Amino acid sequence: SMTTFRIENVRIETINDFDMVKFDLVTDLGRVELAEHVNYDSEGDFKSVEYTDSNIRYNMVDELCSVFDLTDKPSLMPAIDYVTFAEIIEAVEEMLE
Amino acid sequence: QELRQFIESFIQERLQGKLDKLQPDEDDKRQTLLATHRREAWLADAARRVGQLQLVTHTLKPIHPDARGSNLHSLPQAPGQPGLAGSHELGDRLVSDVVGNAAALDVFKFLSLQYQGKNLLNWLTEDSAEALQALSDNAEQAREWRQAFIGITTVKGAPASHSLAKQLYFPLPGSGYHLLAPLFPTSLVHHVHALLREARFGDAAKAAREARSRQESWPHGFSEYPNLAIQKFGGTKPQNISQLNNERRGENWLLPSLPPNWQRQNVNAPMRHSSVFEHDFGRTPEVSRLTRTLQRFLAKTVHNNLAIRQRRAQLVAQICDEALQYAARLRELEPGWSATPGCQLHDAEQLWLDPLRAQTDETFLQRRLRGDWPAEVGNRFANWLNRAVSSDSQILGSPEAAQWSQELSKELTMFKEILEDERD
Amino acid sequence: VTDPEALLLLPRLSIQNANAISSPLTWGFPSPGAFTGFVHALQRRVGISLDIELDGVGIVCHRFEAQISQPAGKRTKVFNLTRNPLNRDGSTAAIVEEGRAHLEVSLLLGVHGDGLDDHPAQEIARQVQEQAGAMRLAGGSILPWCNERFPAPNAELLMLGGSDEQRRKNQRRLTRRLLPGFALVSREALLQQHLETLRTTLPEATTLDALLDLCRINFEPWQVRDKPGWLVPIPAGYNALSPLYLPGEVRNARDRETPLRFVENLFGLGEWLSPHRVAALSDLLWYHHAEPDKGLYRWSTPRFV
Amino acid sequence: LSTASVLAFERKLDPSDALMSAGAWAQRDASQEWPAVTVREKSVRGTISNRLKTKDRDPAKLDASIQSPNLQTVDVANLPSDADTLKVRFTLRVLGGAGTPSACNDAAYRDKLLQTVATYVNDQGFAELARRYAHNLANARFLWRNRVGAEAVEVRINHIRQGEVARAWRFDALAIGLRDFKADAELDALAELIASGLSGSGHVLLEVVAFARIGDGQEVFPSQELILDKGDKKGQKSKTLYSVRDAAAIHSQKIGNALRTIDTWYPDEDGLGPIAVEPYGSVTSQGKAYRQPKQKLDFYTLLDNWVLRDEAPAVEQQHYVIANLIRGGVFGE
Amino acid sequence: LSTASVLAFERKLDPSDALMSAGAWAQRDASQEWPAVTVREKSVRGTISNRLKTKDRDPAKLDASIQSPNLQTVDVANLPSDADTLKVRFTLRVLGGAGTPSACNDAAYRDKLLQTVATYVNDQGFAELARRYAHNLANARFLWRNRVGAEAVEVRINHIRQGEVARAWRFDALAIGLRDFKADAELDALAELIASGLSGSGHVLLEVVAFARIGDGQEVFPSQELILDKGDKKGQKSKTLYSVRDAAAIHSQKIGNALRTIDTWYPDEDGLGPIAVEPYGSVTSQGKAYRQPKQKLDFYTLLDNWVLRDEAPAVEQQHYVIANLIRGGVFGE
């Protein structure tokens, strides 16, 4: 199966008019960091973590796939689909609340 | 020049936007980042992870959702053509389309933020004494930071395109194919966006519209387009592709493309006095606009013959030919019509400004429409043009009115030659 | 560039869901390079069993009903889109913006080759129509013909044989087969006239493409600039930037037997006359020149004025 | 074997936009001069009927927000008060040449894929996908909401050969079901016609005319535009409907999505209906994507296990793989 | 078990627009050639009839206000002044299949909601909601202001099944009250028909023709389209009336609001009449919202107490929950 999702040291930054969440996805194979956008509410508090139209769907694909299993992945399947994405980013969402 | 400004501004940013929520727990990183980015070490801590992006001009990110390829960043070409122009006429070089990893807004701002006569990442590229001399730059770590910063324009390292990134063939004459892969000229898009932004608003066109309030306007030509088109990029987060964040919001727009009948018209033709007052002339909105142009700039002098003979003649005959084509395309909406009540236009437009009739009458009737030439209808159109529009009345012996009369006669003869075969 | 012997015709090609983006900075009409590509695709799926070739193409654009909407009473116009299927998780897709329009247009083909006398006229016209009825045109489909029944024939002529008044008789047949249409030919003439009348400031062609499709307003020597025709900025080909790579070099190509070049697309200037302005109907064709070493691919309208 | 990193396919079963026109019943045989249904506006005043947040549901701001309702200008097309039917006419061409891709890198992968599809077609023809496409044309699945609660829906299909009919089909889209692909004789004649079209023989044409006794001036549901709505000031103009020239029309991809709902073989439940054939077969109504890559019932997994590794899946998963070959798409990495 | 993210419920009891046409009473039997009530213009001027701030309460301000009159065009539909009725005709299709949601997410919350609604239906019928829909069709609640101040209001309801009628109901919308849901015999025949149609066991299409003696040329009240004022001087047309093609017309959703005025169970009083069934039950013509969420008689609180953790409410709150299920709507956060 996949790795135990030990996402750690969940940061929060605001860098040149936008704002991101940084963390350490450390696994049994390797550790990376995943710059991900954050969507606040209309007041100023943490609301959501940019599930769709994200950054690590576009600019961090190979750096996310240098960690997980890319051996039993058929080549017609995009490597952000076989990589489990949803529960990783919901765990990032809940550990900023 | 640069021996204080970027470092002091990095410390000012790290001090203003660094202690909004600053307890000792946040201070355990705030003191480290502030002591690093106050004077010196924040530049090296930023150039250490400053290698996710690569400043490429003719970008290829917005031409597909998530199709990572090779965003080529070279100059377009020599022009080589008589009547073409585009991204190979840039020159001013707004080539800062530096996009890549999204978490490099600090590296992008540090590269851009030295605009005192040059760039800030384009200023400290070669001859790094002018960027590490006033600030006391070292040798090893300073040279490593300078190489990792000014080597950001390097190649991605592959000639690779991508599957959904618009590769398309092009047939050579007499031989095989060169399948061409167009990319997205985002620096040309930025340049034309700046030009069309100052067309939209700003300081020039806003004050020009205010000067055309109060009716005292200056010699100044402002600009706005009808029928733009907004094409937005990125969805709900336009800084997944950089330079689509600040300088166009991810909200590119597209100026002209429309056909002559883009605003789609209709066809209506009655058989009464309300459809007989202009139903034998061809009065539509385009014909009214052409007549308004020829009535607002038609009773003037002819002392500028080089700008008058090719202008007023091409206006009159052009509006007459456009009205002929539009009346032909609009009068043929219904498939059935013949001699009936209210058909006084049918003595002039029964074959010219009217479609083909029904096919159940006697076969010995091909001479009433085959012979009905454009002498009554086209002559009536020429007489209506010469009765509504006119020429100079105090200069009625000059050459401008003679050229206008010859243009009106040629327009009537052309309308007759074009519409006289409504049965043949 | 070879002067044709025939003018094949397809009188009403109603297409649906055409690609009205055509460029990174126009949006109205599908590019004429798509039309020349369609004629070359007809030449590849017809002109191998007929020993002819097809290069010329006419454009008349009878009606153009787009698919636009304006937002909140503003004077810009956003495009309306299509939804997309869901991901593995099933939440929503990354919706990218692409335009869409509806057209009809006739095509004045040009048969240069020698296979015109080995076959009758209605046979070649009928099988060119039977092949053109099943081909995507500019990112969009071609609608077939219902029981309204009138433009179902597909004409042709013979340029090589005839007199001057007989060619005018064939022109009077054709230009009444195309009565409401608006032609489309590109001008280097007017565009170089605007270069060499704005030439005091700067020869930059982009500012004068932007300053030509415009309702311009000036002051006393209200005034709006006029024009005899209706003008359009259209893409006039490709302006390749890369050195031409060998076929196996570029990763992820379409096929590995033809070379690739990376391209920004050019911009010229086009217009919209009625077909009754210019006399000879060999003047309304879009030949396209190409050259290997010079990265310049172009969709000209030669022999016109 | 080494794969291909660019895959493209055509669109066979190519529909059109659907014109709508409202006339009487038992005059449908002369249904050729019926006037079109016009998208026309009204304006509606909405109050609050949403889930309010976790707190701040005190009565003061609630009945303050009801004194300030929100306003919108919804346009809803309707039948005229003279008519009681809904002639929905679209046209459908079937292009043929199903197995041949439109773009692929590797020549050996193209030859392997063409011998796989040739082995399929020579083993068993397109008869299963042709019967199920004919079933989606036999019922009125393209009438998406207009079929919900109609008196009687009748679908007439005509095979146009040159400019005229060559065979007619008078169906009944309520006797023929919605979740059962049982056999007929006339419908299997349509299935033989579509399978003869899809075997590369050539362009085969159809037009489809559906009727619907909705009511004397009741509400139709044409396709709805999507304006992207990226924040405020995308308009008070909600629910902008789709309109070809002086008509209310249904989208071409919506008819093309109603015809290709074939997939009964997804593992979780056959009782939840057939779903639209997709890779990671997902209904946008129910949210969850079926045919996950958890199991081996995906498109990507089955195609790379049936072309490359040579181990064939079952007949039903072969039908799935060739159904989303024949809807088209673009693949590769 | 948790609530789903996105719910939806399709509008059962779908009404149409209304046609207003005026003819003579005692010609109400042959009321099919009556000419449509035409929306036409007049041009009013007003006075100052607003509360002054006591900041503008100065005699120069009043003189400058009443000497500069607020002049504006207003279009108002009156009857033909040789006729003393108002034929309002609308048609109503009653779909049925109530509790099935259109677009859910879960398969557990979906099956729980389906079996809860089916437990209600198999416990007791739709006959309560059907009697109350029959009362709001048998009076003239859909005649909103046209009803008040009328001599006699006759409602004729026909059950259209095929192209012709099947049963005719003649009523008297003043003998039947406005605040009492009193039982009759032929009212219960109508309620049996609507309860047959709401439980999936048929297709019922009703048309409703309501006559109202108002007077020889008096003023009817159609529905009112909104218009924003532009950046022009003096103002312009300020009451645009909704019209179908040369005919004044009541909106569809207004008659839909006046069918579903059911709720006599709200905790304020039964001494204020039935109000419109909505979540956070609110009437804008009285400002105040009944059924506040800080009570336990909301809609969201009752549905999430009756589906998730199964502590069922009373029978009358079950009638309310299924009434604003059957209106339709969007739910979930």
PDB file of C-alpha atoms in Angstrom, chain D residues 135-319:
ATOM      1  CA  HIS D 135     -31.202   1.752 -26.991  1.00  0.00           C
ATOM      2  CA  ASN D 136     -30.074   5.216 -25.944  1.00  0.00           C
ATOM      3  CA  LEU D 137     -31.520   6.517 -29.209  1.00  0.00           C
ATOM      4  CA  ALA D 138     -34.706   4.473 -28.731  1.00  0.00           C
ATOM      5  CA  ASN D 139     -35.555   5.903 -25.373  1.00  0.00           C
ATOM      6  CA  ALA D 140     -35.357   9.643 -24.958  1.00  0.00           C
ATOM      7  CA  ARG D 141     -32.240   9.889 -22.813  1.00  0.00           C
ATOM      8  CA  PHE D 142     -31.225  12.999 -24.776  1.00  0.00           C
ATOM      9  CA  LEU D 143     -34.416  14.561 -23.424  1.00  0.00           C
ATOM     10  CA  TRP D 144     -32.796  14.875 -20.016  1.00  0.00           C
ATOM     11  CA  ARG D 145     -35.361  16.590 -17.813  1.00  0.00           C
ATOM     12  CA  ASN D 146     -38.040  16.940 -20.502  1.00  0.00           C
ATOM     13  CA  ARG D 147     -38.622  13.176 -20.210  1.00  0.00           C
ATOM     14  CA  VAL D 148     -39.315  13.382 -16.458  1.00  0.00           C
ATOM     15  CA  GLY D 149     -43.097  13.277 -16.313  1.00  0.00           C
ATOM     16  CA  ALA D 150     -44.367  13.259 -19.883  1.00  0.00           C
ATOM     17  CA  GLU D 151     -47.621  11.752 -21.103  1.00  0.00           C
ATOM     18  CA  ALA D 152     -46.051   9.998 -24.088  1.00  0.00           C
ATOM     19  CA  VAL D 153     -42.699  10.358 -25.843  1.00  0.00           C
ATOM     20  CA  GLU D 154     -42.302   9.165 -29.422  1.00  0.00           C
ATOM     21  CA  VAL D 155     -38.960   9.103 -31.235  1.00  0.00           C
ATOM     22  CA  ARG D 156     -38.695   8.993 -35.027  1.00  0.00           C
ATOM     23  CA  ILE D 157     -35.359   8.189 -36.644  1.00  0.00           C
ATOM     24  CA  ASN D 158     -34.689   8.554 -40.363  1.00  0.00           C
ATOM     25  CA  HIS D 159     -31.664   7.160 -42.194  1.00  0.00           C
ATOM     26  CA  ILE D 160     -30.757   9.793 -44.779  1.00  0.00           C
ATOM     27  CA  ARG D 161     -28.721   8.361 -47.654  1.00  0.00           C
ATOM     28  CA  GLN D 162     -28.337  11.139 -50.246  1.00  0.00           C
ATOM     29  CA  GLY D 163     -30.791  13.922 -49.424  1.00  0.00           C
ATOM     30  CA  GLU D 164     -33.811  11.809 -48.635  1.00  0.00           C
ATOM     31  CA  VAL D 165     -34.951   9.078 -46.289  1.00  0.00           C
ATOM     32  CA  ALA D 166     -34.120   5.428 -46.809  1.00  0.00           C
ATOM     33  CA  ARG D 167     -35.746   3.879 -43.736  1.00  0.00           C
ATOM     34  CA  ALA D 168     -37.958   5.218 -40.958  1.00  0.00           C
ATOM     35  CA  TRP D 169     -38.280   4.108 -37.349  1.00  0.00           C
ATOM     36  CA  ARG D 170     -41.384   4.952 -35.257  1.00  0.00           C
ATOM     37  CA  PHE D 171     -40.529   4.120 -31.651  1.00  0.00           C
ATOM     38  CA  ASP D 172     -42.175   4.610 -28.259  1.00  0.00           C
ATOM     39  CA  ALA D 173     -39.748   5.867 -25.627  1.00  0.00           C
ATOM     40  CA  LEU D 174     -41.793   4.774 -22.606  1.00  0.00           C
ATOM     41  CA  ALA D 175     -42.619   1.179 -23.538  1.00  0.00           C
ATOM     42  CA  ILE D 176     -38.925   0.778 -24.287  1.00  0.00           C
ATOM     43  CA  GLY D 177     -37.341   1.133 -20.878  1.00  0.00           C
ATOM     44  CA  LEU D 178     -34.593   3.223 -19.346  1.00  0.00           C
ATOM     45  CA  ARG D 179     -32.456   0.746 -17.343  1.00  0.00           C
ATOM     46  CA  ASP D 180     -32.864  -2.477 -19.331  1.00  0.00           C
ATOM     47  CA  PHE D 181     -31.198  -3.244 -22.655  1.00  0.00           C
ATOM     48  CA  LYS D 182     -33.505  -5.988 -23.875  1.00  0.00           C
ATOM     49  CA  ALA D 183     -33.740  -7.072 -27.492  1.00  0.00           C
ATOM     50  CA  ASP D 184     -36.150  -6.073 -30.250  1.00  0.00           C
ATOM     51  CA  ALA D 185     -36.264  -6.612 -34.006  1.00  0.00           C
ATOM     52  CA  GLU D 186     -36.534  -3.055 -35.308  1.00  0.00           C
ATOM     53  CA  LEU D 187     -34.083  -1.779 -32.711  1.00  0.00           C
ATOM     54  CA  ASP D 188     -31.620  -4.503 -33.634  1.00  0.00           C
ATOM     55  CA  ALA D 189     -32.039  -3.412 -37.250  1.00  0.00           C
ATOM     56  CA  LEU D 190     -30.856   0.010 -36.063  1.00  0.00           C
ATOM     57  CA  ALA D 191     -28.053  -1.756 -34.198  1.00  0.00           C
ATOM     58  CA  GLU D 192     -27.028  -3.560 -37.384  1.00  0.00           C
ATOM     59  CA  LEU D 193     -27.083  -0.203 -39.187  1.00  0.00           C
ATOM     60  CA  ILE D 194     -24.862   1.503 -36.600  1.00  0.00           C
ATOM     61  CA  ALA D 195     -22.476  -1.470 -36.475  1.00  0.00           C
ATOM     62  CA  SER D 196     -22.287  -1.372 -40.271  1.00  0.00           C
ATOM     63  CA  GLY D 197     -21.426   2.303 -39.950  1.00  0.00           C
ATOM     64  CA  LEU D 198     -18.785   1.792 -37.258  1.00  0.00           C
ATOM     65  CA  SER D 199     -16.930  -0.925 -39.195  1.00  0.00           C
ATOM     66  CA  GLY D 200     -15.089   1.621 -41.329  1.00  0.00           C
ATOM     67  CA  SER D 201     -17.557   1.357 -44.217  1.00  0.00           C
ATOM     68  CA  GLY D 202     -18.100   5.108 -44.144  1.00  0.00           C
ATOM     69  CA  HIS D 203     -20.131   8.142 -43.102  1.00  0.00           C
ATOM     70  CA  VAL D 204     -23.648   7.014 -42.152  1.00  0.00           C
ATOM     71  CA  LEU D 205     -26.259   9.648 -41.424  1.00  0.00           C
ATOM     72  CA  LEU D 206     -29.309   9.841 -39.166  1.00  0.00           C
ATOM     73  CA  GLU D 207     -31.677  12.458 -37.910  1.00  0.00           C
ATOM     74  CA  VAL D 208     -33.666  12.095 -34.705  1.00  0.00           C
ATOM     75  CA  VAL D 209     -37.027  13.739 -33.965  1.00  0.00           C
ATOM     76  CA  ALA D 210     -38.494  13.346 -30.474  1.00  0.00           C
ATOM     77  CA  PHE D 211     -41.922  14.429 -29.249  1.00  0.00           C
ATOM     78  CA  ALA D 212     -43.105  15.060 -25.702  1.00  0.00           C
ATOM     79  CA  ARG D 213     -46.644  15.728 -24.478  1.00  0.00           C
ATOM     80  CA  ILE D 214     -45.540  17.925 -21.612  1.00  0.00           C
ATOM     81  CA  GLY D 215     -48.547  20.212 -21.319  1.00  0.00           C
ATOM     82  CA  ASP D 216     -50.469  23.198 -22.636  1.00  0.00           C
ATOM     83  CA  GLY D 217     -47.720  25.719 -22.121  1.00  0.00           C
ATOM     84  CA  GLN D 218     -45.634  23.908 -19.524  1.00  0.00           C
ATOM     85  CA  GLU D 219     -41.885  24.345 -18.882  1.00  0.00           C
ATOM     86  CA  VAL D 220     -39.124  22.957 -21.089  1.00  0.00           C
ATOM     87  CA  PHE D 221     -35.516  22.586 -19.940  1.00  0.00           C
ATOM     88  CA  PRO D 222     -33.002  23.511 -22.636  1.00  0.00           C
ATOM     89  CA  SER D 223     -29.300  23.406 -21.959  1.00  0.00           C
ATOM     90  CA  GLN D 224     -27.877  26.075 -19.687  1.00  0.00           C
ATOM     91  CA  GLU D 225     -24.779  28.149 -20.349  1.00  0.00           C
ATOM     92  CA  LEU D 226     -21.992  28.290 -17.824  1.00  0.00           C
ATOM     93  CA  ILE D 227     -20.594  31.727 -17.177  1.00  0.00           C
ATOM     94  CA  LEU D 228     -17.410  31.151 -15.218  1.00  0.00           C
ATOM     95  CA  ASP D 229     -18.410  33.475 -12.318  1.00  0.00           C
ATOM     96  CA  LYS D 230     -14.955  34.307 -10.954  1.00  0.00           C
ATOM     97  CA  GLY D 231     -16.141  36.409  -8.047  1.00  0.00           C
ATOM     98  CA  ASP D 232     -18.517  39.336  -7.868  1.00  0.00           C
ATOM     99  CA  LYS D 233     -20.131  41.154 -10.823  1.00  0.00           C
ATOM    100  CA  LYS D 234     -20.550  38.184 -13.137  1.00  0.00           C
ATOM    101  CA  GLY D 235     -24.149  39.372 -13.387  1.00  0.00           C
ATOM    102  CA  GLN D 236     -27.476  39.290 -11.652  1.00  0.00           C
ATOM    103  CA  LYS D 237     -28.493  37.459 -14.854  1.00  0.00           C
ATOM    104  CA  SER D 238     -28.686  33.889 -13.589  1.00  0.00           C
ATOM    105  CA  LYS D 239     -29.535  30.767 -15.640  1.00  0.00           C
ATOM    106  CA  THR D 240     -28.661  32.039 -19.117  1.00  0.00           C
ATOM    107  CA  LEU D 241     -30.019  29.393 -21.478  1.00  0.00           C
ATOM    108  CA  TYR D 242     -28.478  28.112 -24.704  1.00  0.00           C
ATOM    109  CA  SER D 243     -29.818  29.556 -27.934  1.00  0.00           C
ATOM    110  CA  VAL D 244     -29.020  28.833 -31.549  1.00  0.00           C
ATOM    111  CA  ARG D 245     -30.583  31.404 -33.892  1.00  0.00           C
ATOM    112  CA  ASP D 246     -34.127  32.167 -32.664  1.00  0.00           C
ATOM    113  CA  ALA D 247     -34.433  28.844 -30.860  1.00  0.00           C
ATOM    114  CA  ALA D 248     -33.902  27.107 -27.549  1.00  0.00           C
ATOM    115  CA  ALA D 249     -31.399  24.343 -28.111  1.00  0.00           C
ATOM    116  CA  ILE D 250     -29.737  21.481 -26.291  1.00  0.00           C
ATOM    117  CA  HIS D 251     -25.920  21.244 -26.257  1.00  0.00           C
ATOM    118  CA  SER D 252     -24.126  18.859 -28.572  1.00  0.00           C
ATOM    119  CA  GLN D 253     -22.013  17.404 -25.791  1.00  0.00           C
ATOM    120  CA  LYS D 254     -25.119  16.851 -23.672  1.00  0.00           C
ATOM    121  CA  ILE D 255     -26.736  14.742 -26.374  1.00  0.00           C
ATOM    122  CA  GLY D 256     -23.371  13.036 -26.882  1.00  0.00           C
ATOM    123  CA  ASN D 257     -23.278  12.293 -23.158  1.00  0.00           C
ATOM    124  CA  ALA D 258     -26.808  10.949 -23.159  1.00  0.00           C
ATOM    125  CA  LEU D 259     -26.119   8.540 -25.999  1.00  0.00           C
ATOM    126  CA  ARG D 260     -22.917   7.033 -24.605  1.00  0.00           C
ATOM    127  CA  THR D 261     -24.354   5.978 -21.223  1.00  0.00           C
ATOM    128  CA  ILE D 262     -23.541   2.302 -21.682  1.00  0.00           C
ATOM    129  CA  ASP D 263     -21.480   1.263 -18.720  1.00  0.00           C
ATOM    130  CA  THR D 264     -23.406  -1.272 -16.659  1.00  0.00           C
ATOM    131  CA  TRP D 265     -20.345  -3.249 -15.603  1.00  0.00           C
ATOM    132  CA  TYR D 266     -18.847  -0.975 -12.931  1.00  0.00           C
ATOM    133  CA  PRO D 267     -18.440  -3.057  -9.784  1.00  0.00           C
ATOM    134  CA  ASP D 268     -20.263  -1.287  -6.953  1.00  0.00           C
ATOM    135  CA  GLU D 269     -23.915  -1.652  -7.993  1.00  0.00           C
ATOM    136  CA  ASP D 270     -25.695  -2.580 -11.200  1.00  0.00           C
ATOM    137  CA  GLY D 271     -28.922  -1.415  -9.538  1.00  0.00           C
ATOM    138  CA  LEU D 272     -27.784   2.225  -9.563  1.00  0.00           C
ATOM    139  CA  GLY D 273     -28.245   2.408 -13.339  1.00  0.00           C
ATOM    140  CA  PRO D 274     -25.872   2.457 -16.280  1.00  0.00           C
ATOM    141  CA  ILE D 275     -23.363   5.283 -16.104  1.00  0.00           C
ATOM    142  CA  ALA D 276     -21.679   7.397 -18.758  1.00  0.00           C
ATOM    143  CA  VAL D 277     -18.609   5.706 -20.217  1.00  0.00           C
ATOM    144  CA  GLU D 278     -15.530   7.575 -18.974  1.00  0.00           C
ATOM    145  CA  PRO D 279     -12.031   6.819 -17.758  1.00  0.00           C
ATOM    146  CA  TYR D 280     -12.471   6.635 -13.979  1.00  0.00           C
ATOM    147  CA  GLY D 281     -16.142   6.288 -14.786  1.00  0.00           C
ATOM    148  CA  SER D 282     -17.709   9.203 -13.001  1.00  0.00           C
ATOM    149  CA  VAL D 283     -21.223  10.573 -12.828  1.00  0.00           C
ATOM    150  CA  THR D 284     -21.170  14.296 -12.143  1.00  0.00           C
ATOM    151  CA  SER D 285     -24.503  14.018 -10.319  1.00  0.00           C
ATOM    152  CA  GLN D 286     -23.532  11.477  -7.656  1.00  0.00           C
ATOM    153  CA  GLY D 287     -20.124  13.032  -6.971  1.00  0.00           C
ATOM    154  CA  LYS D 288     -18.148   9.828  -6.453  1.00  0.00           C
ATOM    155  CA  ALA D 289     -16.138   8.466  -9.371  1.00  0.00           C
ATOM    156  CA  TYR D 290     -16.773   4.775 -10.018  1.00  0.00           C
ATOM    157  CA  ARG D 291     -14.269   2.396 -11.678  1.00  0.00           C
ATOM    158  CA  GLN D 292     -11.482   3.418  -9.333  1.00  0.00           C
ATOM    159  CA  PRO D 293      -7.868   2.311  -9.788  1.00  0.00           C
ATOM    160  CA  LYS D 294      -8.264   0.553  -6.441  1.00  0.00           C
ATOM    161  CA  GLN D 295      -9.381  -2.528  -8.354  1.00  0.00           C
ATOM    162  CA  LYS D 296      -8.479  -3.447 -11.941  1.00  0.00           C
ATOM    163  CA  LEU D 297     -11.584  -1.963 -13.576  1.00  0.00           C
ATOM    164  CA  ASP D 298     -10.077   1.307 -14.798  1.00  0.00           C
ATOM    165  CA  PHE D 299      -9.555   2.291 -18.427  1.00  0.00           C
ATOM    166  CA  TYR D 300      -5.837   3.033 -18.128  1.00  0.00           C
ATOM    167  CA  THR D 301      -5.096  -0.164 -16.196  1.00  0.00           C
ATOM    168  CA  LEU D 302      -7.173  -2.390 -18.481  1.00  0.00           C
ATOM    169  CA  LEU D 303      -5.817  -0.909 -21.702  1.00  0.00           C
ATOM    170  CA  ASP D 304      -2.212  -1.293 -20.627  1.00  0.00           C
ATOM    171  CA  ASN D 305      -2.966  -4.824 -19.440  1.00  0.00           C
ATOM    172  CA  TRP D 306      -4.759  -5.776 -22.672  1.00  0.00           C
ATOM    173  CA  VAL D 307      -2.461  -4.200 -25.267  1.00  0.00           C
ATOM    174  CA  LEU D 308       0.957  -4.696 -23.657  1.00  0.00           C
ATOM    175  CA  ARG D 309       0.841  -7.630 -21.228  1.00  0.00           C
ATOM    176  CA  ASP D 310      -1.429  -9.596 -23.662  1.00  0.00           C
ATOM    177  CA  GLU D 311      -3.704 -10.936 -20.897  1.00  0.00           C
ATOM    178  CA  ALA D 312      -7.229 -10.278 -22.069  1.00  0.00           C
ATOM    179  CA  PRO D 313      -9.938  -9.117 -19.662  1.00  0.00           C
ATOM    180  CA  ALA D 314     -13.509 -10.355 -19.907  1.00  0.00           C
ATOM    181  CA  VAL D 315     -15.895  -9.596 -22.770  1.00  0.00           C
ATOM    182  CA  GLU D 316     -17.697  -6.920 -20.754  1.00  0.00           C
ATOM    183  CA  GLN D 317     -14.526  -5.015 -19.912  1.00  0.00           C
ATOM    184  CA  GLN D 318     -13.522  -5.269 -23.565  1.00  0.00           C
ATOM    185  CA  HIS D 319     -16.815  -3.527 -24.382  1.00  0.00           C
TER     186      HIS D 319
END
